[PDB]
Amino acid sequence: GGLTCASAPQGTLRILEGPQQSLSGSPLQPIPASPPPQIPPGLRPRFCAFG
């Protein structure tokens, strides 16, 4: 029950949970481009010149 002292420890192993692999996909997923505005189909002159 004396509990004598011991020598100096050489190395200290650190145990830790691993990096989060297979979380990010190898291609990227962007928000798609909002489309450029279209001229709508079915546009015709509705105004006739009077008389």
């Binding site: 990227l28 962007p30 928000i31 798609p32 481009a33 909002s34």
Partner: protein
Amino acid sequence: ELIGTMEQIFMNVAIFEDEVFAGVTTHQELFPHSLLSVIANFIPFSDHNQSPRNMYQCQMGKQ
């Protein structure tokens, strides 16, 4: 992702999908006019008129 006030001085966000590159770009804003208030969105064609015109329109609409 709810980016806060101090994260986005270290993040490379992108506005357009074409401006997204590989390895450099890590985020993207939702819609590209997100930088504007509710009232300054209500201004039609904001990107064509000059800036104090917009800053004056935002206090026209509130009058």
